[PDB]
């Protein structure tokens, strides 16, 4: 095939041009995101029961729904939380590869057939079934510096004037508002209600009656009396539109003539739908919009579009209203794409340089400058064809491939230049002979390399999804590389290279360049002499090899495995958690106290603190809070001292003594949730009808025994909440019947006033919005207030709650968990230093087996895909290993020569490991993929040395040693150029700091080190492998 294009250079250009065009179009319409989607499809079912406790939500909503999630396809497991904030969240996780759309609709439908079974008020609130992406494109903060409006005002304005427009912005998928549009608010007064013999029941009734839509009909409506001249609609009663009208609602008429109005027994105001969350941006009331990227959309275009949309609607904001970007991944992504474009560019220059440093002409230096791009462009086109996107992973998959594409370019060219000199052959006939030497090997490298990489596209679970991003990118590039090397480069070489007279090695040339040649032709002789000398007694080296291999294993198992390097995404969190019963005001003090810390003792780095009072990943409540710290740009935070990791340690340290509660700080995961490499996700289960209390005992028991193995287990802890004091009110049925008081009047006067009640809707300036009834704060705070509420009895008398009730304190759960339909408790933890998560799990399994009868367990986090996708690595790489073998066996038509090549694997690994262990890094995804390219390049070098050696013996009849020496001599220059170009090209990644520097350091060191080791070692060891292997058989 190379001969074919050697004679048809134009055709070669055509194929190149097409690849270039497709590639070009590819990067035009190709998706762009920080990360592809790797987590298994998930669907969440959210419901809200205002005023309800955890137990109430669970037993009337959670359980009901859970019991109807039958007949859905590919469900891995289902988990849920029922809490005292009145909400329930059921998460269903589906098998990877499941269509999320089908998954959602199948879930949504089963719900629809369970709705009649749910409490009425839960049915009015609604039940939301949504996809569980969990990744936001950015979040827009909306605050008011004028101090002219509350977060409820900011929210309303946001929902009615910004929400809709953002949703329609090109590329935006979903959008969450941080708060709610107004709600008509009726704040009742029990002292006023009693004064008129009224109850929250009378209130509600009047609202339902006086705030409604009433159908009427038409005048001259069909079927009419003939002769009818007009037909018109009859508009009757419509919904109220203002607080004034609501206050004007007639509640009662006394027989003296007076009129009792609603504004005469309650405060009427436009407020929030819920008050459990108070958000602030640098101490100012705040609101916002969580924005997610739409499928297959370009992240950069979307960020720009939502920006242009915001700018476009700015002229209509209220005084003091301005938006802010606490969270935005776009900048990161932009930086990432930039840094990747540099790396390839400079790598291309570096190749030019060394290519010119070793070679005489420019026509040569030019050839790779064409080949590499063509190969890169084409790779994009192939990814496009596989629906891949430009993201953090795919881009690095390409940088880790540079060496492989640079090598292919340098190899084909260098060999042609080497053939022309060692024999006066002209550019064309010389290119024909050159290819005839490597072309065979070239296909081998391809088959072998794919043997190494495609297997990696077969790991399962979210981890498998990551390996797949690198795998396909690399194999594709590599694949196109051999194609281009077999079609485009030969044509270019037999076309642009100038003749070079037999025996001219530049030794007889001008100044410097002439000196270099002289010295290189010199070092080549030394080098060949060392090998002859080394091949003069191999034993020494067989021994050194074992020392290496042995050192590799030791160095390996001591290297701490991990996921993806943490990063400084200019933002991080700080968790705040207070004691059981801690009020909303108390945690406000702390959050402010945290905010202040950040805006003061860190004024240099912190840009803003978004203090969310009332939320906490492992459980909502008044005693929980979180502050998202948005840092200044990277160019204002130089010095490790001013980085998330550092700032975090200093922050947690400083908060390490706030005596009111635990307030730690922390950087955030590279992707989604735990992912804790050393972490495991346990699930304790009630398999009999044990109950919360007995489950708790079992939990404690398991946790106590866990603390007795700090050698294997570390940080064993429950991911949920602890029980707290509850106010148990008992209604005496006999007494209520005796005084003539109905249980329904009792339960609504109670729950409405103290829990709140969603009555119906009203239109606010054109938008339907809820109407809520609830007691005024001061009358629903303490146990003594209970007695201040009255209920009208049949006989008309008013009776105080204290007449028919009695109470007492007790303990209960403010957050009941559940796994696969049964009561449960989640437990997180990690393997002790040195131990593997696998070992840590195995122990927890042994300790769990010693728990009370009826207590089961199960894994669910990263733990599910590890007890399942347990391990393929060996069974996968054993396959890779075997595959590589057959390929070589075919290339060399020998059942033994392959071993002389395979023996190089450790040569690069040791270097990567050395560099790794030294720089302190860890065994992560980048480090690993890097190990694969390094082995690949070294393997290539060997294949080409063995190919030449075996070649000379068979063709010239040269001896084992003579052939080997001759091959190694010929392969020295090319091999050196590639390593020199690659090591220098990868060098900028190794030193790089800040801004995606974690990933770059990872891909950098493991590669540079393994590269330095693989090269300096292979040129001296493969000759020994070939020779000792050939000696044996």
């Amino acid at each position: 095939m190379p001969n074919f294009f050697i004679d048809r250079p134009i055709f070669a250009w055509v194929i190149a041009i097409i690849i270039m065009l497709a590639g070009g179009l590819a990067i035009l319409k190709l998706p762009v995101a920080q990360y592809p989607t790797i987590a298994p499809p998930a669907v969440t079912i959210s419901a809200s029961y205002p005023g309800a406790d955890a137990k109430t939500v669970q037993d009337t909503v959670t359980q009901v729904i859970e019991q109807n999630m039958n007949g859905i396809d590919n469900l891995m497991y289902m988990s849920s939380n029922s809490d005292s904030t009145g909400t329930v969240q059921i998460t269903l996780t589906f098998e990877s590869g499941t269509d999320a759309d089908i998954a959602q609709v199948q879930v949504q439908n089963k719900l629809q057939l369970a709705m009649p079974l749910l409490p009425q008020e839960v049915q009015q609130q609604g039940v939301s079934v949504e996809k569980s992406s969990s990744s936001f494109l950015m979040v827009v903060g909306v605050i008011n510096t004028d101090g002219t409006m509350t977060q409820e005002d900011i929210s309303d304005y946001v929902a009615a004037n910004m929400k809709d427009a953002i949703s329609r912005t090109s590329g935006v998928g979903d959008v969450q508002l941080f708060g709610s549009q107004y709600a008509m608010r009726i704040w009742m007064n029990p002292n006023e209600l009693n004064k008129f013999q009224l109850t929250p029941v009378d209130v509600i009734t009047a609202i339902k009656a006086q705030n409604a839509q009433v159908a009427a009909g038409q005048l001259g409506g069909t079927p009419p009396v003939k002769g009818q001249q007009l037909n018109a609609s009859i508009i009757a009663q419509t919904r109220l539109t203002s607080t004034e009208e609501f206050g004007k609602i007639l509640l009662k008429v006394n027989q003296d003539g007076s009129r009792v109005l609603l504004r005469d027994v309650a405060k009427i105001e436009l407020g929030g739908e819920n008050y459990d969350i108070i958000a602030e941006f640098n101490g100012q009331p705040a609101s916002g919009l969580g924005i997610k990227l739409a499928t297959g959309a370009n992240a950069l275009d979307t960020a720009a579009a939502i920006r242009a949309e915001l700018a476009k609607m700015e002229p209509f904001f209220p005084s003091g209203l301005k938006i802010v970007y606490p969270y935005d991944t776009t900048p990161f992504v932009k930086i990432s794409i930039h840094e990747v474009v540099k790396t390839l560019v400079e790598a291309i220059i570096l190749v030019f340089l060394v290519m010119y440093l070793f070679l005489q002409n420019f026509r040569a230096t030019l050839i790779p400058t064409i080949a590499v791009p063509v190969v890169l462009l084409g790779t994009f086109a192939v990814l496009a064809a596989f629906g891949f996107s430009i993201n953090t992973l795919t881009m690095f998959g390409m940088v880790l491939a540079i060496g492989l594409l640079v090598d292919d370019a340098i190899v084909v060219v260098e060999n042609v230049e080497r053939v022309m000199a060692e024999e006066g052959l002209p550019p064309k006939e010389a290119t024909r002979k050159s290819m005839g030497q490597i072309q065979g090997a070239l296909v081998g490298i391809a088959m072998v390399l794919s043997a190494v990489f495609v297997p990696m596209a077969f790991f399962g679970g979210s981890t498998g999804a990551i390996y797949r991003q690198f795998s396909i990118t690399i194999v594709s590039a590599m694949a196109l590389s051999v194609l281009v090397a077999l079609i485009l480069t030969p044509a270019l070489c037999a076309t642009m290279l100038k003749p070079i007279a037999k025996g001219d090695h530049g030794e007889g040339k001008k100044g410097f360049f002439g000196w270099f040649n002289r010295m290189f032709e010199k070092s080549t002789h030394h080098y060949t002499d060392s090998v002859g000398g080394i091949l003069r007694s191999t034993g020494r080296y067989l021994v050194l090899y074992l020392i290496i291999v042995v050192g590799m294993a030791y160095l390996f198992v001591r290297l701490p495995s991990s996921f993806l390097p943490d990063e400084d995404q200019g933002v991080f969190m700080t968790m705040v958690q207070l004691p059981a019963g801690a009020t909303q005001e108390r945690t406000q003090k702390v959050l402010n106290e945290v905010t202040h810390y950040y805006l003061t003792k860190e004024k240099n780095n912190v840009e803003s603190v978004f203090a969310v009072n009332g939320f906490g990943f492992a459980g909502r409540g008044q005693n929980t809070g979180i502050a998202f710290v948005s840092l200044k740009d990277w160019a204002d935070r130089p010095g490790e001292e001013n980085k998330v990791e550092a700032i975090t340690m200093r922050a947690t340290r400083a908060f390490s003594q706030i005596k009111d509660a635990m307030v730690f700080a922390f950087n955030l995961p590279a992707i989604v949730e735990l992912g804790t490499a050393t972490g495991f996700d346990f699930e304790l289960i009630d398999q009999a009808g044990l109950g919360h209390e007995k489950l708790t005992q079992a939990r404690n028991q398991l946790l106590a025994e866990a603390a007795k193995h700090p050698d294997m287990l570390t940080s064993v802890r429950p991911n949920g909440l602890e029980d707290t004091p509850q106010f148990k009110i008992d209604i005496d049925q006999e007494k209520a019947q005796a005084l003539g008081v109905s249980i329904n009047d009792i339960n609504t006067t109670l729950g409405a006033a103290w829990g709140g009640s969603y009555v119906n809707d009203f239109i606010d300036r054109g938008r339907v919005k809820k109407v809520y009834v609830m007691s005024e704060a001061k009358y629903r705070m303490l146990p003594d207030d209970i007695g201040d509420w009255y209920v009208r009895a049949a006989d008309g008398q008013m009776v105080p709650f204290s007449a028919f009730s009695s109470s007492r304190w007790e303990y209960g759960s403010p957050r009941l968990e559940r796994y696969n339909g049964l009561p449960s408790m989640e437990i997180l933890g990690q393997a002790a230093p040195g131990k593997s998560t696998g070992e840590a799990m195995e122990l927890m399994e042994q300790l769990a087996s010693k728990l009370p009868t009826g207590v089961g367990y199960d894994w669910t986090g990263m733990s599910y895909q590890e007890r399942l996708s347990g391990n393929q690595a060996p069974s996968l790489y054993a396959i890779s290993l075997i595959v590589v073998f057959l390929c070589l066996a075919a290339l060399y038509e020998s059942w033994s020569i392959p071993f002389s090549v395979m023996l190089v694997v450790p040569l690069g690994v040791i270097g990567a490991l050395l560099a790794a262990t030294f720089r302190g890094l860890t065994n992560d995804v980048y480090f690993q993929v890097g190990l694969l390219t390094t082995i690949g390049l070294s393997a290539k070098n060997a294949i080409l040395i063995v190919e030449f050696a075996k070649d000379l013996m068979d063709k010239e009849g040269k001896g084992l040693i003579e052939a080997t020496l001759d091959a190694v001599r010929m392969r020295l220059r090319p091999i050196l150029m590639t390593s020199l170009a690659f090591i220098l090209g990868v060098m900028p990644l190794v030193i790089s700091t800040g801004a995606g520097s974690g990933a770059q350091n990872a891909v950098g060191t493991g590669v540079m080190g393994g590269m330095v080791t693989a090269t300096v070692l292979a040129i001296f060891f493969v000759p020994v492998f070939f020779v000792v292997v050939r000696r044996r058989f």
Binding site: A580, G581, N700, P725, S806, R808, W809
Partner: protein, 156 residues
């Protein structure tokens, strides 16, 4: 609150015997309390941890401390069926006829949950069998409204 009190309050909850013992050697205020007035003694009695009840009493615990609603450790113990604890508290001067804000007495709570053995013990230490709550109900009344004749019989 107090520094170690918080720790002692949680200890009596989980029943961590050893920590409580260490906490005693350090003076963790046995009179600490959560927001509703539960004392380490209330908790331990509620959750049924006998040893910690015995330790707390050995270290000055108020055997008749009451919560915001007037309930005592004896109320809790009786109500949740911890016979051994019910005996210890009584043995140390727990008020057997103690009445919470509703007029409820340990005897009421025991009867309601049908804890016979505890009721007899309560009767033993002189519990008032005719005690009435805010609704006028006696342990007998509650006894028949529940349909517990064994209990109803002991109450004669």
């Amino acid at each position: 609150g107090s520094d170690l009190g918080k720790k002692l309050l949680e200890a009596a909850r989980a029943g961590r015997d050893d920590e409580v013992r260490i906490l005693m050697a350090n003076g963790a205020d046995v009179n600490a309390a959560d927001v509703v007035g539960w004392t380490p003694l209330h908790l331990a009695a509620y959750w049924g941890h006998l040893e910690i009840v015995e330790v707390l009493l050995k270290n000055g615990a108020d055997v008749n401390a009451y919560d915001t609603l007037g309930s005592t450790p004896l109320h809790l113990a009786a109500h949740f069926g911890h016979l051994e604890i019910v005996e210890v508290l009584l043995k140390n001067g727990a008020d057997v006829n103690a009445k919470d804000d509703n007029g409820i007495t340990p005897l009421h709570l025991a009867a309601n949950r049908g804890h016979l053995e505890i009721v007899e013990v309560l009767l033993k230490y002189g519990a008032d069998v005719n005690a009435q709550d805010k609704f006028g109900k006696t342990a007998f009344d509650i006894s028949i409204n529940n349909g517990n004749e064994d209990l109803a019989e002991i109450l004669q």
